[PDB]
Every structure is written in C-alpha cells, then in structure tokens.
RNA sequence: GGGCGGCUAGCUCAGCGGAAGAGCGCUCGCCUCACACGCGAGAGGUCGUAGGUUCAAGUCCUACGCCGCCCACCA
C-alpha cells in the first residue's frame, strides 16, 4: 500500500484487472461445491459497450462474487453475440460507405472484412468487462459463430425440422429493400407519419358504385375484394356484387369480413393479400390468390399494373397512380393522415411486405410448452410484474419467421434438389452431415439453402451452446438450470422468451431459475441508451474519471427494483467519494497500526459497540443480497460505513489509541476486515487492494463471506446515550457561535453513566470537560436520553441558542399533540398492537418530559 | 384500443401500513493530528387530484390528471 492523502483509482485498479484478466476464477464441474450459474447476455459485435451493459454486468459480477465468496461454484459464462442484421449494417454503413466503397465487394471478400470487425468489437467489449473488473469465467468464452456455438444451431434446427416444428412455406414476410432481407415483427418499428388517406370509387356490376379509402393507391391493381363489416348492412346491399377497378377490366367481388371497420373511412377496405398483413389475413380468410403489382427491388410489375404504370419506383408509382386516378376521374377525396408507417428498425427505411418461400417455426404448440412450467412456477420473476408480461406475450405467438438473406449469420443447413425440388435436411443423429443425394430423387445435384438464421434464433440457443449442448457435455449436466438471468427488459421477447422455448423442448426444463429483468439508464433527456439513438456514454470514459468501483457503485446503487437509470454524473460523484472515505478509513487504521505501542488491553464500550452494530450489518446486507436486492444493499453498507465506522467509531477510538489500548486497534482491524469483504462484490479493486495491505492476503474475492456475530443490547443503548451527550454540546457550541475548537465546560442530567465511564472520548469528541455541579443560569439541551446545561460563561450567541429551542417546543408540543389524540383516538386503544400503543404512550410521557425541560429554561434565560 | 412504469425536500432518486429519507445544492461554523472527494450544526416536503377501505395510507382499493414505455391489422 501507498497510502496517499486520497486515493488514485489509476495506481490500483490496472493491476488487479490485469491479475484477474490472465488468470481468470475458471468453473469446476467436478467442484463437489454448490454451483451458481448466470448466463452473460453477449454484447453485440457493433463498436464497444456503453453505460447500459456497465449496469447489466455490474450487477451480474456482484452476484458471481457474492455467491462465490458465499461457498458455491460461481460459474458466469461470457461471449459475444454476432449480431447478425446489426453487426451487418455497421461494417456496411460507416467503415465501408465511408471507408470508401459499400459497392459490393463480394459475399467473400465482405464476410472477411466483417470478421476484422469482430475481432475488433470483440476485443474491445472484454478489455471493457475486464477493466470493469469481471470475474467471468474467460476460459468458455463463447461466441455465438465459433465452431461450438455454429453446431448449437445446426443441430438444433435440424432437430425442429425433422420434428416438424420448423417448416418451409410462402407465408408472407416483412422485408426491408435496404438490406435485401427479411425482418421479423420485432424487429420491425412503425413510428406515426404525415400521409395522404386516398377516397377512391369504383363501377360495381350493373348498379354503379363502391367507395374506398386507401392509403397506397398502387396496390389497387393487386386487389381481390372489398371488404366491408359483415353488420354494416348499412351503406351495404351492393354486397356480393362485383366491380372493375380503377383502370381495369378485373372485377373484384364485395365481400364481407369481421375485419373491416366500419366506422373508419368508407365502412369498406380494399383488400391486397400480396401487399399487406391484414388483407392477406381477410384474403386467406375467404380465400383469395395473392397477386402482386410491386416487386422486392420496390419497383411496379405485374399482370393488373396498367401500361406506362409499371415500371418505376413504388412512390413515383402512386404519383403518377393518383393523377390516373382523378383526372381520369376516379378519385374522390383526397386528405391528410397519419399513418401508422412501418419502417426497419436497423436502418430506417420503411418496409414492404411480400409472399415468399421461408423457414417458419411452430411457435404455438412451443409457447405452451413452456406456458406449461411458468403455469407450474417453474420460474421467478424479479420484480414478478413480468411473469404476466412474459406469459401474455407467450399466450398469442405467431409463427415465426427463422430464415434471413443476410451475409452474416448461420448458412442455414438445407439443401435443394436441383431435380426433384425437394430439401434435404441433416438428420439429428448425423446432424452434422452433408446430405449428398437427394432422398426423394435420388440424385447428387443438390443445393444448399444459402439463406441464414436470424441472429435471436442463435442467441435464443445459449443457456445451453455455453455449456457445449449442441453434444451432451459434463458443464451442461454439472450446471444447466441457470440460477438467475440478469437482463434489462428491452429484450424479455426476443431474448428471454426465445431461449425459454429452446430451452423447455430441448431438455424438459427451465434454462433458468429466476429471471432478474433490471432498468435501463439512460442520457439525462430520458431517454433509453443505445448505438441507435447515439447517446452513448463509454464507460471507460467514467471509469478514468471517477473510476471502476465508483461506476460499479453508482448503477448499482440506482437499480432499484428494476426501475431505470437517469444518467447523472452527481451519482458517479457520490461513489467516488464514498471511495475515498472508504479508502481513508483504511488508511487511518493502517497509518495506526505503524508504530503502535501497546500499554493495555482493554474492552472499550466504542469497541463493543461496533461489533455489535455489524453484526446488525452483516445480517441486514445478506438478507438483501439474499433477495437479490444490491441497490438496497449499496445504501446500507454505506451507511454502515461512513455512519457508523468513520463518523462515530474510529473518533471514538482516537482517544483509546492514543493511550495505547491494544484491543482496540485489534476491533478497529477485525472490523475493517469484514466491512471490506461485506463491500467486494461492488467495488472490488480497492476493496481487495486495502484487504491486501491489511491481511497480507492476495485474494480477498476467494475469502469467505462474514457471518454475523455478536449484538450487544445494553451496549448499543449505552453508546447511543453517549452519541446525544456528544452532540449536544456540539449543537450547544453551534448556536453558541462557539468555534469547534473551543474548549468548553457543561453539565449533563440523566442517562449520563456511558460519558463518565468513557469520559476522554466524551472528552474529545465534544471538546467539552464535565462539571461537578448543575449551573444556576445556563443554555440548555434537551436529548431523548440525556440534558446538558452549558455556563452562562464568556460572549455567547442566545438569540440563537433561543430561536432554536424556541421552536423545539413548538415540535414538542405539536408532538404531544399528535401522541395525545392517537391515544384517546377510537379503535387505536383497542385494534391496535400491544406494543405500537405502549409506545405511542410512551412518546408522549416524554414528548413532555423534555417540552416542560426546554420551556423552563428558555423562559429562566433572561 | 389495450397493458405497464413514473408522479416524495430546490435537483436526481429511495421508502409502499404505524412518529417523512438519501446524495447533491443551500445556510451557519471549521485547513479539529484518515479524509476539504473532508468535519460539525441547520434550513428545506399537507409524497400529482378526487374519492373511499382501515384504529392506522406517500404506504391498500377506486376513478382521474399529466410524463414515458410496450403490445395492437383503423385500410
Ligand atoms: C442475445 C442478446 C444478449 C443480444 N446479443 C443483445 O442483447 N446484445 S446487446 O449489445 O444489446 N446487450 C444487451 C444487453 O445489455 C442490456 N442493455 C442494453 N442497453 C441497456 C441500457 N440502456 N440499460 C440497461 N441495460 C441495457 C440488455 O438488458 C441486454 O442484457
Ligand atoms: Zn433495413
Ligand atoms: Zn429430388
């Protein structure tokens, strides 16, 4: 140790990260000790990490630590997620356009270019977890590509096909014509946008009229009905007719559907199967065959699509489309909207939608699957209002569309019969074979789908590709059910929810045992956190200013009951300092220890107290570690701390040190010890380096964790006695406008057994000497337990020391007010506990007791 | 159209059945021999509104007001 005035995060936090970086606290299946597993979320591979995963890991490694130095096998598995659309759009974006050229350079050459990326990114995001002092389990380092983790899927998917749960079909699909590729309904965003809501009319078979509101007139020519609510008889006895449409000669049949509002525009819609979800569901509903009028690249074609109309954009289409429509006298009314715009959420665009030959995933009969255990509890929810919010989401899934035609991810292992045009799946069992004859032709030329997995696909597959199950591991048998899932709840759907599915039907259990969803933080506007909104903060950046243990403090101090995280340095401040108390508290017993001389060796109330006070605290702080509350904790232990070990106990001790008092120095050691085992698992670099320069020991993260002790009753009750004789003097000096190094004689009444036993503390901490004899006329203190009476000697501040006590009484009497009409309250005397009564009549004896005190002096000063 | 979270001291946030709290800011004193990233003494809240249940309600029930999320197929 180097025991510095204050305390430099720099010249100690490098060095222990880098001890813990190359040796890492590797996991022991065959450890014959209780384990605790926790699944990393792994970071996508886009840049570095920001303050959001600080909180994420933070809280994790607290959890690690805690358990660890609590006696289990503390297993945390860490890795990195590819990202797949993500990753994807950031090496294409930035490095490249920018870079120079996104100018396809090849499905080769880019998928290089990407991997050069990921080594950055992932080398990055672990300097980051390193620094920030994670004791993960480095040696299964997993990365959602790496060969393990690529045969978790490739066997996992082969699995579901053969088992049906996976099939291949048309089913239509949100595609985003940015990135050439499907999304899924999560992955897609719809944010309100300034529209034009057309009123289009048209001939009807023999009558004459049919009116309709459309917000894309284009996608009138892939039309196939009108549809119109099946009560709304109303303007509609022209059901079951026909009707050409606007520039054709098609006649599309007016049908009803329980779909149709009628209340919005014309209490009919014009319905496009190939062109949009809600008509494709009516569509398929009454049975109707898509037809499409634009295709993928967004550009108009089509049987319907008029001459002259097909071919440009799929904008520029309705144009031209509208002008068609009214000049040719079609149109009717024209007006503002705001539509519901769906857009792509990884590169803004708005989407389109298309029919489309995919891989879907049965998630109906897999979503009760897993209902089937939640139901059961099965599962724990930390703050429980997401049980319902993860089951809900469960109880109406919809397929779920697995295939993507990105570069990144996993190719898909599929193959297409260049003959018989039928796929070829792996088997389970052989799982990681190539079929090379089609099993339905019989012929060699195959094909492989050259699609790719969506990115949550993966990473839905981790509780169990961690742990080497794409085969049947030791690690996977040792610990599978993880003990808790630490994640924000941005993604409880498709995070959490997707791995419970893989992880209820591959094996017949809970990936995890409790799910502990915790808030976002977020820049100081509110607003969440994200690459995406660009208001991320690295925390390194933190960490060099205020430092590691500080940052770790913070965000765990904030995630309080999975409630967010408004950015606000003042917090970061606060750890920092509390640091630093922690550090010179240490520093103080240290320089202490130096050269001490040892003249006696006895027991001190100040000792006897705290040792009781933390046996208070090693209770209470496990308790709510127990209950996986650390925000909680956070505060208590400051408290405990900076309340009860800085501010009244080593004062207290100065003196007793001072005359040499062994057993003292040795509480002031002892207690130490625990306190910095108690604060660890949130600020572990100086928490381990003052452990260190204390015990001499190199590994206060292998320690064990403290049990509670001794409660000493009398004696809290006696120092407590002590604590008001003390500050009353210090607040009679105070208004006094007596300077704090003034020396000064008073006189105490009552509960005063504990100031002449321990007389020189009393001595040093008030810098006050007893007197002998109650004083005629003097200012007076009025505490719960003991009065003190300060000699009218010398130039004295009344008016103050008046004011002041002038207004104690009139809290006192306002006090016995309260008191007083509770007591003679109905149904409080009686309904009341035994002992919430006794005391409320016990506050009044002395709310009383002390006014009476106060008043008498306050009017006997002249 | 559904659910959910928030609404407490000037600011940022805890507390959620029994005498209103913290950090910072502020007022007054202190370079008191671990710490000025500090020490001591204070000021400052009828806990968003209206109702109830309860001997007892920031703390539970019920509407509502704003603020923000999530899920929704009003073309
Ligand atoms: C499979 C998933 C783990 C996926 N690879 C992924 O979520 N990748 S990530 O980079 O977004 N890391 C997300 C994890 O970090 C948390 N997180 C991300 N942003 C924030 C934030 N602003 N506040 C609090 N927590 C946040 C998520 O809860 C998740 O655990
Ligand atoms: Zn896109
Ligand atoms: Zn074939």
Redesign the pocket.
């Known amino acids: 140790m180097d025991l510095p ?4 995060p720099k010249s100690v936090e490098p060095k222990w990260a880098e001890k813990w970086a190359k040796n890492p606290f590797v996991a022991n299946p065959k450890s014959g000790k209780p384990p605790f597993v926790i699944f990393m979320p792994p970071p996508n591979v886009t840049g570095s990490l920001h303050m959001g995963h600080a909180l994420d890991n933070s809280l994790q490694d607290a959890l690690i630590r805690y358990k660890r130095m609590r006696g289990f096998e503390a297993v945390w598995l860490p890795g990195t997620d590819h990202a797949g659309i993500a990753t994807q759009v950031v090496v294409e974006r930035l490095l490249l356009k920018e870079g120079k050229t996104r100018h396809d350079l090849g499905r080769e050459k880019f998928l290089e270019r990407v991997w050069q990326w990921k080594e950055e990114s992932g080398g990055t995001i672990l300097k980051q977890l390193k620094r920030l002092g994670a004791s993960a389990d480095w040696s299964r380092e997993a990365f959602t590509m790496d060969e393990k983790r690529s045969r978790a899927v490739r066997y996992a998917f082969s699995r579901y096909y053969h088992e049906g749960l996976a099939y291949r079909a048309p089913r239509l699909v949100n595609w985003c014509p940015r990135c050439e590729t499907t999304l899924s ?2 992955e897609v965003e ?1 944010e309100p946008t300034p529209g034009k ?1 057309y009123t289009l009319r048209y001939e009807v078979e023999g009558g004459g009229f049919i009116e ?5 007139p284009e996608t009138v020519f892939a039309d196939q009905a009108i549809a119109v609510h099946p009560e709304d008889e109303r303007y509609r006895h022209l059901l079951g007719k026909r009707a050409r449409i606007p520039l054709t000669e098609v006649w599309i049949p007016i049908l009803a559907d329980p ?12 319905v496009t199967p190939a062109h ?3 008509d494709y ?1 009516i569509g398929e509903r009454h049975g109707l065959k898509p037809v499409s009028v634009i295709n993928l690249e967004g550009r108009m074609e089509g049987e319907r699509v008029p001459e002259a109309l097909r071919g440009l954009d799929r904008f520029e289409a309705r144009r031209k489309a509208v002008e068609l429509f009214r000049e040719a006298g079609h149109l009717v009314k024209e007006e503002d ?1 705001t ?2 715009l769906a857009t792509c959420s990884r590169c803004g665009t708005p989407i389109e939608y298309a029919i489309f030959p995919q891989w879907w995933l049965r998630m109906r009969p897999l979503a009760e699957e897993v209902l089937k255990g939640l139901r059961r509890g099965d599962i724990a929810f930390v ?1 429980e ?1 997401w049980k ?2 993860n089951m ?2 469960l109880e109406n899934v919809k397929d779920w569309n697995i295939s993507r035609q990105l570069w990144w991810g996993h190719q898909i292992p599929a193959w297409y019969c260049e003959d018989c045009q039928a796929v070829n799946v792996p088997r389970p069992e052989r799982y990681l074979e190539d079929p090379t004859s089609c099993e339905a032709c019989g012929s060699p030329r195959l094909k492989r789908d050259e699609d790719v997995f969506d990115t949550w696909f993966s990473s839905a597959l981790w509780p169990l590709s961690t742990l080497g199950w794409p085969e049947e591991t030791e690690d996977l048998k040792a610990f599978y059910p993880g003990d808790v899932l630490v994640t924000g709840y941005d993604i409880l ?1 498709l995070w959490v929810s997707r791995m419970e599915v893989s992880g209820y039907h591959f094996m017949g259990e809970r990936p995890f045992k409790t799910v502990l969803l915790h808030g976002l933080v977020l820049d100081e506007k ?2 969440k956190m994200s690459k995406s909104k660009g208001n991320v903060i690295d925390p390194l950046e933190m960490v060099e200013r205020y430092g590691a243990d500080a940052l770790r403090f913070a965000l765990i101090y ?1 995630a ?2 999975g ?2 995280i ?1 950015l ?1 340095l ?2 970061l ?2 750890a ?2 509390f ?3 922690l550090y ?2 240490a ?2 017993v240290l ?2 220890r130096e050269g001490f001389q040892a003249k006696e060796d006895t027991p001190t109330l100040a000792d006897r107290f705290m040792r009781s006070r933390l046996s208070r605290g090693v209770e209470e702080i496990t308790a709510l570690y127990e209950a996986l509350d650390l ?2 904790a956070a ?1 208590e232990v ?1 408290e405990l701390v ?1 309340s009860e070990f ?2 009244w106990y ?2 207290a001790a ?1 003196p007793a040190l001072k005359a040499g008092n062994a057993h003292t120095l040795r509480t002031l050691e002892e207690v130490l010890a625990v306190l910095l085992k108690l604060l660890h698992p949130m600020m572990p670099f100086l928490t381990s380096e003052l452990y260190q320069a204390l015990t001499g020991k190199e590994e206060l993260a292998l320690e064990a964790w403290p049990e509670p002790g001794g409660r000493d009753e009398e004696a809290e009750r006696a120092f407590e006695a002590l604590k008001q004789a003390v ?1 009353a003097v ?2 009679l000096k ?2 006094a ?1 007596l ?3 003034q020396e000064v004689r008073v006189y105490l009444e009552g509960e005063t057994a504990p100031v002449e036993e321990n007389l020189e503390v009393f001595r040093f901490l008030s810098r006050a000497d007893l007197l002998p004899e109650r004083p005629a006329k003097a200012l007076v203190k009025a505490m ?1 337990r003991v009065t003190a009476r300060m000699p009218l000697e010398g130039l004295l501040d009344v008016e103050e020391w008046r004011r ?1 006590q002038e ?1 104690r009484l009139k809290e006192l009497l306002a ?1 016995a007010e ?2 007083q009409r ?1 007591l003679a ?4 005397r009686e ?3 035994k002992e ?1 009564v006794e ?2 009549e016990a ?1 009044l004896k002395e ?1 009383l007791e002390q006014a009476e005190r106060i008043r008498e002096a306050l009017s006997q000063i002249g």
């Open positions: 005035k204050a305390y430099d309904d999560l719809t809501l309709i509101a459309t917000v894309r779909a149709v509002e009628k209340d919005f525009g014309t209490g009919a819609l014009k949009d979800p809600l569901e909207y539509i519901a703050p209002r319902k919010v809900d989401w759907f509110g607003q904030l309080t009951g409630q967010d408004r606000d003042r917090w401040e606060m920092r300092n640091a630093n108390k010179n508290a520093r103080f320089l202490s925000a909680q505060r400051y900076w800085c501010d080593l004062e100065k500050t210090r607040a105070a208004e406008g300077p704090p190094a719960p002041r207004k006090l309260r008191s509770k309250s109905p149904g409080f309904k009341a506990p919430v005391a409320e506050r709310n």
